[model samples]
Structures are given as C-alpha cells and as structure tokens.
Target chain A: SNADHHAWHRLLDRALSEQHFQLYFQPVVAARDTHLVLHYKVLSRLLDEQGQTIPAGRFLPWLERFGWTSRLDLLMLEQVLRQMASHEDCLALNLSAATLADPHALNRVFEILRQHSDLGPRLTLEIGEEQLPEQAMLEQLTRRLRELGFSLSLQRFGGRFSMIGNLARLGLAYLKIDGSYIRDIDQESDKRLFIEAIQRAAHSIDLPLIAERVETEGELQVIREMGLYGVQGQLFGEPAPWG
Target chain B: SNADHHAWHRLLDRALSEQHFQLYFQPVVAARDTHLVLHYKVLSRLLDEQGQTIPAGRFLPWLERFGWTSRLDLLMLEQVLRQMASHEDCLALNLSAATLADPHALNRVFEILRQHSDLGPRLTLEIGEEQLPEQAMLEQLTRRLRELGFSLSLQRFGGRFSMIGNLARLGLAYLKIDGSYIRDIDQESDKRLFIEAIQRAAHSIDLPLIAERVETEGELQVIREMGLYGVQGQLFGEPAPWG
Candidate 1:
C-alpha cells in the first residue's frame, strides 16, 4: 500500500504545526573525578503513519531542500519551550543554520526568548560551527543571547581551528569537539595533541571545552588528563525519551 | 589609448606564448639562531604593451574566467624552470588548481619533471589547501610526485583545520601556515593558541610548519619560542630579482 504523492511536505507540515515530534535527551555530564551534574542534550525524532521512525537523514534533507529549515527551527524552539514547562532540570538544544541567518526567524526567536525571559539560562542554545551565520549576524545573535540572558555554545568546534579566533570574541558557554576526533583518542597521539590545542583555544577565551560522543573508558581517561569541561555519549547512555 | 576590442585576451596570448613574464624571488629562511638557509618562493609578474606591469588583480580573473588558468600555470612552470637553470639555489613554486586537475596540464608538468629529473629537489611544488584537487587525485599527484623525485608542500594551510587530517596522510615537505593566521599573531592570544593547534597538527604528521608574511620582531620571537621550521616575509626583506 503506497501513496502516489510523496506528501512529505504535508507530513512535515502536519508534524510541525501539530507539534507531533518527540524529544530525546542525553545527559551532558562532568564525568572526570566528579559526581552527577547534568544538563540533557535535546535530540528530536519523527515518525510516519505506520509508526516507524523517519530518521533525520531521511527527512531533514527533504525539509531543507524544500526550504522548510526556517519553519523547522522555529517549530523546534517552541517544542523545547513546551518541554521546559514540565522540567526543572536544564537542557541544551541545537539551532539550525536557517534560524541563525533568517532575519524573520531570528526576530521571531528573539521575541519568544523575550517572552519566556525567565527560561533562558535553563534552555541553552547550541550552534554548529559549519552552519554559523555571517560575522555581523553572528555578533548580533551573540549580543541578543547575552541581552536575553540565554547561554550559547559552539558544537562540532574543532572541525576548523581558524574559527577559534572568532569564538573568543563571542562569549560561548562550551566548545564541544566534533566526535570524529574523539573516536579513538587513547591510541592516536596526533588527535590528543590537537584536542589539547583546542582546549587551550577554548580556555584562552574563558570558555569550557566539552568532548562529544565519548564511548570508552580509555578515551575518557585521556580527555580527563587533557582536561574537558564535560563529556557526552553512550558512556553515559544514548539519547532517549524521559518520563 | 582606447581599444575597440578588449584585446585583453590577445594580450595574454602573446605574453604567455612569448615567455615575457618576470620572476621575483622571496627568501624562505631559517631566521632564528641561523645565518642563511634558503629556498626562494617564486612570484610572477605580467606586463602590457606599453611596458607597464599588469598586476595579477587586473588580469587573473579574466584568465580564470576564460579558461586560461591551465595555460597560465604551464607558462609559469616553464618560466620558473628557465629561472632555476640560472641559479644553483632551490625554489618553491605554487601549482594552480587548473594545473593539478587538468589531465593535460598535469601530464605536461609530469613529463617536464620526468625530463628534468635532477631539478626535482631544487624545485619544491606547493599546492594551496583551498584549491586541492579531489582526495584521490591529490593522492595520485602525491604518488606521482614521489615517483618523479619531486618535493610537494601544502601552502595557505590551516585556512580550515578539517583538511589537516587529510594532509597527515600525504607526504609533504612543508606546511606553510596561511598569512591570515600569521598577521598580528603576537598580540592576539586566541590566534596564538589557534596557531599552536595548527602547528601541533602539522607536527603530528612529522611535517615542518612554516610561517608566511611574518612582519614584526614580537611575532618572530613568539614563532621562534614556539619553534618554527622557517619564516618568510618583509622581515626577511621583500621579494626581488636576484643577480
């Protein structure tokens, strides 16, 4: 049984408008010689009619190709706000490139942040380095985030060291290294030194550097020795829905 | 004088085929605690009919747009070779994307290198990171360079650090940090730490990192303390013709 039309636009429209997507949270923790302190990283999940999940890989490109990223970003923001209503524990959520660059979307987001002014600190925003907006827009976003009392972090941070200088100008909460460098840190001496430099870059700007997707004891030990602000991945648990 | 036709295209034809361009050499030196170890970086100049120099700014884009990069690259290579014959000293020359990616241009360069087998070590080839050919082609170029007894280096490196992982897998003589990173590095702490990461990335691959366009004593002192493979810029005296 198949439909003739792809109807993906309809699926996305309904999903977004009706607020049908799911939020999956994974803890961002201080795992080195430390006790439990957490702010969950929010991941979103979507589904089709038969109840099977449509992975972001499957639907996101379609959404992006069809120019729905702005809409998607806006929807995601409000979705997170809705979730924040029930939870006292803080959470981190990623903003899409469209959200950062689109003037209308950015203004809308700012208005929402202003309205929910009290929830800013507990709802941290993460922006991907590759998708960051132009410098002036980025500066404006930084100023707005600070003015609105929200926290902002840079993710997939060390993909390009050239970007580090700009980050020092923007007050970032965390510089989370992309997982590619974290995959086998214990054995790769090259990666260890590179990450050390990234940490140095982060600290020079008075920002914490977090290691993303840390999966093993050996990797954890090496990064701990190098000094990480926080760690996230299966070493804690995979992202999942909370009751 | 006003010309009916942009004769610009015709002008380039005569300049390239007639081998009328000039070469300027800038010394790349072991500047700290050293007298004179050198390999010159070759810079080229073009001229118009009235014996006036046509800055690269004036004509390069036209050459690039009208598909003449391949020709320009070949002419530059031959010009450098002619210059090399007159001097026993080594030189470093940049290869254009057109030269590396164009099969004919690359093969022509290959034959020239294979013909002048002894000239390889004395002529280091530089490939800018931004214009690097596809990964497999770059690998093929590296393989061919090794088989031909030529030296290859990556220039304008660290514009993007993601490319560093790829360079570690290639055989290179030097990793020249792009001038953007070197400009005013002594006063910019974030830039210093960022460059330290780039240096660390270069060393992990067992390659020496060279700083380009370094202008101040404070800058040179920092690079020397941090340890540099070589330094090049006005501090070493601007590029000029050698007797």
Candidate 2:
C-alpha cells in the first residue's frame, strides 16, 4: 500500500513538473434557451508520459492527498488567464480549497488578476461550497475580487444552504446547481422542490442560478421550466481545448 | 514537518491501541412549537498519554492524512452501537466519508446494524453532504440503511446542493444546517434568507431541518423565528459522556 501511494506521489510530481496538464473549456448556456453561450467553465486534465489523459475525478483526490492541489490550481489559473488575455468569451476558473487557503497561492492569483486587469470583467472565479474559505477571509477575498472587477460564483451551490446565508454579502454573480440534482430533475419531485428552494434563495439575493450536467432533453426541459439562468452539460456541448 | 506528521501518526496509533477514545453527546432540540428533544449527536474525542482530551478538530485531519479514518470510524461506531443498546434516547452518529467508502468498514457497519435490528429506528446516521458515497453505491446504501429501519440525515446539508436532488429518493428523515450560518444568525440577513430557502426545501420534501451550533439566545431566537425543526449547540447544552 505504501509503495502504491509513493508511486502515485511520484507520478503526480512528474505530471506537474513536466507541464503535462491541459485546460479544457465547457460552454455554459442559457437555461431557458440553450442556444446562447453565457460563459465557459474551465476544467483541467493531466497526461501521462504515454500520452494518456487522466480524468480529474481520479487525479484530484490524489493531488489533494499529496498537498499538490494548490499547485495544480495555480497552474490551471495561469493557463486560464493566459488564454483569457486574448479570448473575448467570459471564462470561469475553479479554485481549489487549498489554493484559497494558501497565502502564497492566493497572492499569486491576485498578481495574475492584476496583470490581466483589462480581462477582469470577462473573468469569473468559481469556488465550491465545500472549499469555502474562512468567514473573515472570505469576506475580505470577496471584496478584493469584486474591487478587481472579476465576477464571483459559487460552484455546486445547493449542497450547503446554511453557508448560503453567510455568503449573502459575498456579491456572487451566479450559483451553479450541483449536477446530481439536475441529472434526473424531470423524474424526481424532490429534486424539483430542492431546485425551487435554491431558486427562491438565489433570486432573493439577486443572484442567477445555473444548472450543471444536464445530459438529457428531459433534464433540459426541467431546467428551462424552472427558469434557471444557465446550463452546462452534454445537452449543450462538451469541453474543448483552446483553439 | 515530517517529524510532526510522524508524531501525530504515533499518537493516533497509541490512542487507538490503548482505547483512549471517548464519545460525547450533544442534545438536539426542537426550535419552535414542540420544543421537543429530537436526538443527541454523537461526537468523539481522543486522550493523550497524560489523559488530556484532544478535540476531534485537532486530530481528524491527521487521521484522514494517514488513511486511518476508517479505522477510527469503525471504533466510534462500535462504541455508539453499544451505548444505543442500553439507552432509550434517540442518538445520531456522524459517519466519516472514509468509512462509507471503505468496503470492510461498511460491511462491519451493516453487520452491526443487523445485529442490533431493534435499535435501528432509534438511531440516525448523519453523513456530511461533501462526504457522500459514490453515485453508484449511494442509492444501494441508502436503500439498505432504510430497509434496516435506521433514520438517515445529511449533516451539514447546505454544503453541497447538487447532490441533494440525487438524495431525494434516499428517504432522508432530516437535513442539518451547518453551524457556520447559525453562530450569529440574528445580525445576518443573508443567513436568514439562506435558512429560509433551506427550510422551504426541507419542508417541501417533508424532511425536518436542524440548525447546528446555535450558540446564543439571539441565534436560538432567530432559528425559532424561521421555524426550523431542531437546533444543536451550546445554547441548548454541551456534550457529555454516556452514563
């Protein structure tokens, strides 16, 4: 077991150092009408020496275990910003909890944002509810990010409603509904009820809601009926590398 | 840093072998109308060689780092079940994500639940929204747990709303609001709005909501005003060892 763990650690180290990671962008479309592109959610994938791409679901936990997530987040952010400088489309980058917690990585993020100051308005920083920063720090970070002209959004918003109240003043532009609730919304009443509640809360705060991972037409229909702001999943489009 | 890490590993090993662990119970009470005793949440603390108590928050991250969380969970579950056998009051045990993912530990949990079938209805298994089991196994586990007659509640429910829809069919009896939003509720309108949304969602699905960490009278008053089903924290009572 120890040997296996060490091998993973080495592989991750190699992947990071060798720059074997790629950034892919998945389009987020208007929920009520899926044709319009609202923004792109940036995702990361790692490659092995053999050129096999590694799925985030498999590598992220390992990265988290080895304390490499902050590094990976920074790497992704760097690439995302570089691409944002030339691209006009709004781009959202997901920041890992580790990156938010680490002062150095956070400072690096701020520096990058400052360097690409003109691109600020076209950029969004998405943080998962589970990876939320400490309350005091969160307030400060939200204020600073807002001052820098970047929009903020909470990714996977429905999972933690209690924190929703705490984030009220964070000035988030959007709430991305977790995909689990969206996958079978047409068939699940409880999902509808939860989404409705989230919708009411998001509207109360004047923040738009986005349903992620809408794979089927039925799910898309439910998202449209719920009157959500945006949708991201196979029904809309798949993530693609920067052109 | 390595030395510190090793030291923690040794400490945990010693603590486990010596059985220097204790379970603490904190009361969960109705927020309004009934003011009834809902259940007692089971918490864990470890004792050092000098018999000094160490808080879970201090050592849990370390346990997770060393892959020892499942071991600790099984130990805690063993103790909780034993106490539940003799106690007439309803009890809730928080299961770690690692425990749910560990086949051996999960198997042990099922075996224990089977052995104490009579105590099933009186016990509640509270799992964090973030630590939810994989999508493939979640439905099966939820169904099996329900079949055994044990109450299932999502602890810190607001942290991940995306998965909430998927859990709609899992037969959850309750949803516990994270305490971060409850600590200073009276002054935070955002918290109020968020809680209101969660309350609406929970009630829509006939699942009662419990506000965790209601520390002050002001907080408790707000919870009552919002019509939440239950509240847990120092405002109600502190945790105590099983008699």
Candidate 3:
C-alpha cells in the first residue's frame, strides 16, 4: 500500500513538472433528449507507460492531503481551456471547494480563462455541496468568475434547505441533483418525492436541474418526464480525448 | 360507401367551423444533440362526433381539391397563434402551396400576426415544395413574410433534383428533406449519399437541413453523424395535444 501511495506522490510531482496530464471530456446529455449534449464534464486521467489511463479519483485524495492537488488542479484547468478552444458547446468543470480556497489554484483558473477569450460564457465551474470552509472567499471567487463570463453551478446540491435561497442570490446558473439519490432511484418512492421537492425548489429559484448518474433508459425516461433540463451519467459516452 | 364519403365531407365541413378543428405540435430535435428541441411543427386535426380525432392527411387533399382547404388552413393558423400565446415555445406551421399563392390566404396569415404582435420571429411558415410553380408569387410572399417578421422554410423538399439549385435562390431559413427519401433511410445507400450531398448543398446556401420521417434510432444516428442540423420523426414524439 505504501508503494502504491509512493507511486501517486511521484505521479503528482511529475504532473507538476511536465504538466502533461490531459483533461478528457465526457458528454452529459439532457435525459429527455440525448442529442442535445448541452454540457461535457471535464475529466482527468494520467497516461501510463502502457497507454492506459490512471484515473484522477485514485490520486486526487492524496494530492489534497499533501497540498499538491491544487497544483495538479490548476494544470488541468489550464489544459482544459486550451483543449476547449473551438468547442461552442457548453461545458461544466467540477471545482474542489478546497482548491477554490487555495489562492494559487483559483488564480490559475482565472488566468486560464484570461488567456482563452472564447471560453468565457461557455465555461461553467461547479462547486460541491459540502459547506466551503472559506465561504466568503468562495463567494468572491464565484462572483469574479461570473463577471468574467463563466457560469457558476452548485454541484451535488441537496439536503440543505437554507442554502437554496442563498444560491439564487449568487446568480448561479444550474444545480446538479446529487448522485446518492440516483443510486437507489429504481426502488425508492420516498427518494423520488424528495427529488420532486428539490425540483420544485430549484424551479422556484429558476435554476435548471441536472440529474447525475442516470445509467438506464428507464431512469432517463422517468427524470425526463419529471421535467429535468440536463443529465450526466455513464449512459453517455465515457471520458475520452476531444478527438 | 357514399355514407362514409358523406360522413367525411360533413367532418371536413365541421372542421371549417370555429370549434371543430384543433392545432397540435410535435417536436423536432437536432439529430446530433437530441436534447435541443429547437423546432416544434404545428399539426392540424379535426374532431369527430364520437370524440375521435382525424388525421390531417386523411382530409387535407379532399379539402384542397374542393377549395375549402384555405379556410381550414387559415383557421388552424389562427388557432396555433392563440395557443402559442400561452406557450412561448418556437412553433412552425405548414402553408399549402395554394395558400401561399392565394393573396387572400396569405393576407389572413399576416392579419393573425398583426393581431398577435408578440408572435413575431417565433412564428415560422413552412411552404411546400410545389409552391415554386408560381416563383414570383412565392418570392414576393417570402419577402413580405420575412419583412413582417416570420421565419420561412421550404417543406417537402427534394422530390425533384432539378429544382435543388433553384431552391438555393429562396434564401430559406429551413429546408425540410422530403419524407419519402427518409422512409427506408437505413437501407438506401444512394439515398444516404444524396442526403449527404443535400446537407452539403444546404450548408453552402446557409439553409438548415431538417430530415423528415425519422422513425428509428439508427436513422437518427446516421443523420447526426452526417452533420445534419434538424430532424423530425415519430420516434421522438407523435403529433399530439400539448400536455
């Protein structure tokens, strides 16, 4: 396990030095209509010797623990902006709440957008549901990004009744429904009701809801009929290069 | 047989009345991105004594021959405009070749637009391919409609290859590929190639290609991969009342 841990540390060091890690794009289609791929979630994978991909999920925790994740996150953001140069489609990038609090990483995100003028309104930065420790800093960063033409979305948003009204004041564009509800979606009527309530709350604030982890046609139909505007799931194409 | 004919004529006559005819809409999606339901085609139907609805194809030809089709068409146009007031969805209504050529029918469409000042560019009039017979009239009507703030499209296109070049001169906002070629869409290689060529031609002329009668998923994928912009097919939804 130490050997595996050491391997990730070395990978992160290399990621900072070479900055060769490529950001991949996976399409998230609107559940009701698959052809309208309104957004592509930015995915990162480390390329290995055998031409296989080492997923970011494995090493990302280690980076956060060691404070090296911010560097890698910044590099990936820069690469994403460069890759998305010609893409007119709307896209969402998951931003680690902790990283947004990291001044260097937040600056890098802003700098990347400054360097690529076209990615302004088409780019969206998604913040996680966990209450950010530096809420004021995050609010300032979000407003700055919005002013710079990037849309802001609160990701994994649920269970916080008080935060819903506040999010509207921030001028956020979208709210992604949490994945935990989707895991038991097939069997839970109570969960469905809860989602419906969240949908109503989202609508009350004029926020578009995106269902996450939709993997089946049946689920797609249910959420679509429920009137969701966007969806993200493995049912769409898996993460791959832009080409 | 005469009793059936008499029932049909009576239904058509009733459809010409204010209460019997209704306008419905079916969505047209971008094949490449299904979520984008950019266009809604307005379809017309008649109500029967037993509360059944009759299809437009069944009675339109008869009404057109009897010269009563313009009355029903104008009524449907008025009804569609009224319905669209509550629903802000982009709507398209088909115009008969005869209606476009008839000054009285064309004036009635403009009158409806004048009445509902808000339904400006959102109202689209799809003129059938046969309307080119009176080229000057078609041009004048199209220019007038565009000037008065209506989107113009040529429907039932590509029945004759000779007119394809002439269609380029219409400056159409949308070009609907005829349903006949799309019927056996998956099996016909020549049809596929012809459509690809048509797509290229349409793009060259700055017209959007909307493939009609797309009933299967395979057909949807093929057109999408070929880079066609819009598609109308029953697989997405049938002509039904607004829910």
Candidate 4:
C-alpha cells in the first residue's frame, strides 16, 4: 500500500510539474425535437511520460487524497479559459469541490474570469449537487457569476434526491442526472421509476434535466420518453481533443 | 511547513494510540417557552501527556489533511455510544464528512448502532451544512437512520445560505445557526437581516432553528425577539464532561 501510495505521489508530482494535464470535450446534444449541439463538457486527462492519456476518473481520487485537486483545478480552469479565448464554441467545465471551497483558488478563478470577461457568457461551470460549497459562499459565488454572465449547472443531480426541492432556487442552467442511473435504464424498472420521480421533481422547479452516459438506443428512447432536454455519452460522441 | 506537518502527524498518532480524545458537551436549551434542556452537542477534544485538553477546531483540519478523520470519528462514535449506554440523556455527536463518505467507517458505525439498538432513538447525529455526503449515500443514510429512529440535525446552518432552502426535506430534528452569525447579532444590521431571512426559511419548512455561540444577554434578547427555538453557547452554559 505504501509503495502504491509512493508511486502515485511520484506520478502526480511529475504530472503537475510537467504541466501534463489536457482537456477533452464531450458533446451534450438536445435529446428531442431539434437534436442540436448544446455545449461540450470539458473533461480533464493526465499525460504520462510516454504521452499516454489517463482519464480523470483514474487519477482524481489520488489528486484529492494528496490535496492537489485545487491546484489541478486551477490549471484546468486556466486552460479552459485559454481555449475559450481562441474558440467561439461553448464549453462546460466540471469544477472540483476543493476549488469551490478554497478561497485562494476561488480568488484565482475570479481573477481569470474577469480577465476573460467576453467569454463569460459562453463558459459554463458545473458543480456536483452533492459537492456544494457552504451556503453563504455558494450564494455569493453563484450571484457573482450570474452577474458576470457565466452559466451554471448542477451535475450528478440524482446523487442527492433531498436537494432536488432546493435546486430551482440555485439559478442553474442545467441539471445533469448522475450517469449510474442512466446506464442500463431500459432493463431496470427501479431506474425508470427513480428517473421518472427525478423528472417530476425537476419539472416542478422548471429546471431542465440532462441524461448523462446514455450509451444505448434503449436508454436514449427511455430518456426521450421522459422528455429530458439533453443527453451526453459515447452514444452521442466520445470526448475528443478537438471538436 | 514540512516540519510542522510532521509534528502534527506525530501528535495525532500519539493522541489516537493513547486514547487521548475527550468529549465536551455544550447544552442546547429551549429559547422561547420553558427554557428546558433540549440536548447536548458533543464536541471532541485531544489530550496531551500532561492531560492538557485541545479543542477539536485546533487539530481537526490536520486530521482531515492527513486522512485520519474516519478513524478518529469511529473512535469518537464508540465513545459517544458508550456514554449513551451508561446515561439516559439525549446527546448529539458531530459526524465527519469523511466518516459519512467512507463505507468502512459507515459499516463499523452501522454495526455498533445495531449493537446499541435501544440508544438509537436517543442519539442525534449532527452533520455540518457544508459537509454533506454525496446525495445517494446521504439519502440512504438519512432514510436508514430515520427508520432506526435516530434524530438528525444540520449544524452551522447559515454558513451555507444556499442550502438552507433545501434543508427541510433532509428530515433534520434541529437547525443550528453558525456561531459567527450569533456572536455580535445585536450590533449588526446585516446579521439581523440575514438571520431573519434564515429564520423565515427555516420556519417555512417547519424546521426549528437554534442560535449557536450566544454569549451575551443582548444577543439572547435579540434572538428571543426573533423567536429562535433553541440556543447553545457559553452564554447559555459552558461545555462539561457531563450535564
């Protein structure tokens, strides 16, 4: 265990120092009617010495464990801003909880956002429903971002069903359902019921729901029947370096 | 910084091994009607060789940093359960976010809770408004605890104003306002407005609010005028080994 820990420490240290992190964009498209491209979700990847790309899911836990998530998030934010400056397309970045909670990281983020004021409207920030910052801080940040014209979304929505009642007041642009519930939805009666319940709750507040990780035609059919606004998964398009 | 880090690590190790942790109980009392004792909020403390008690606030950040919080929480939970088994008074223990997030810690807690089934109704578990677990886990845990008859409370409420509107559905027995808001309420117009807004929010959902860290007669008078349901801090009573 110690050896494994030591190896992760080394790899993370190298990754951070070498600036080996990159962003991959996944398309989120309208599920019904228009079927238009809504926005791209920014995914982080780590490049090893051999230039092998590692998905964030594989390394984010270690980053959190080592208390490096804030630093990594800041770097990712900077890159996202840079990309926005060069491109006209809209993008959504999934911010780490550490970044939201850490005042210093938040200040840096604010500074960058101010510098790229024109891109504010096009840049969408997604915070996990379960990983929300404290109320005062979250309120202040959300208000400030709204004033700055940055769109906000709550990803992993069904993760905290209790929070569904409170979601409408948060001024969110999208509610992304947690991927686990979207996977194999056609085969699971329980999943259909849960998603239906979530849909009813989301509709009460007029918040649009986006189904995540919908990999099959059956899953897409189920979500479309539920009248979900958007869908993102390999079925639509895999995350790519360029759109 | 490395030296300071190592020193804290050593101190925490010694504290854990020597069972140098202690619980301090601060009394929460009714604010309006009869001023009856409601319950005690369990605060953890660390002890050195000379038995010098250290407040949890001083060392908890380090514990979280070192990822030893789950272990510490389990130890504290066991101590709390043991105290409840011997005493008749209802008490609230603060569960760390790590403990809620860790399945192993949850399993151990569930096992211990099953063993002390009789004390379940008397035990009030308090989680910080800012430190909520992911939604599915939170819902699962809250439902299970409610089924088992354990009262739940969200402490440090106003710390996260955005989450306040979402609190009612969480099935909390109490809503403890963050102490900083209570400390100088009489002198601050902004504090009064914020507290009033929070009071309205709490009442709308039928969730009673508790004013924490009430240290002055003026603050108490102000809170009474505002109709807070409960109060806890030095002004009410100091934390003791036993109430």
iRMSD, per candidate, in listed order: 3.5, 3.2, 25.1, 11.6
Give the per-residue lDDT digits (tens) of candidate 3, residues B1-243: 768767777767865774677777789888888889887998887776787878878887778756787787788788888788787789888777667667788788787777876786788878777555555676677677767777788788775433444455566778888777666666654456456556655675688888888888878877877888899888886788887
Per-residue lDDT of B1-243 in model 1, one digit per residue for the tens?
A: 245235777777777789777777888988475356568898877755686655666777777866787887778887788777776998898789977777988899998887788788898999888887877888888899999888899888776565566666678899888878878777876667677777766777788888888788888888888887888887877576665
Candidate 4: deviation at residue A211, Å?
A: 0.5
lDDT of 3 by residue, A217-238 (tens): 7777778778889888888767
What is the Å distance of residue A153 in model 2 from its true position? Answer: 9.9
Question: Relative to the unseen true structure, what is the C-alpha lDDT of residue B72 in candidate 3, on a scale of 0 to 100?
Answer: 73
- Tell me, by lDDT, which candidate is best: 2
Better by TM-score, candidate 3 or 1: 1
Report how far off residue B168 is in candidate 2 (Å): 2.2
Residues B53-142 of candidate 4 have per-residue lDDT tens digits of: 788789999998899998887788888888886778888888888888788888888887778788877899888878877656777888
**What does candidate 2's lDDT look like per residue over A119-160, in tens digits?**
888889898976677789988998889878888888876656
Distance (Å) between predicted and true CA of A102, model 4?
1.2
Q: Clashes in each model (backbone N, CA, C under 3 Å)?
A: 0, 11, 5, 6
Best by DockQ: 2
Stronger candidate by DockQ (2 vs 3): 2
User: What is each candidate's DockQ, to 2 decimals?
Assistant: 0.31, 0.36, 0.01, 0.03
Quote each prediction's TM-score: 0.76, 0.62, 0.48, 0.51
Clashing pairs in 1: none
Model 4, A64-127: lDDT tens digits are 8999998887788888888777778888988878888788888888888888889987889999
lDDT minimum window of 10 residues, candidate 3 chain A: A159-168
Per TM-score, the best of the predicted structures is 1
Q: Candidate 3: how close is chain B to the reference, as a TM-score?
A: 0.91
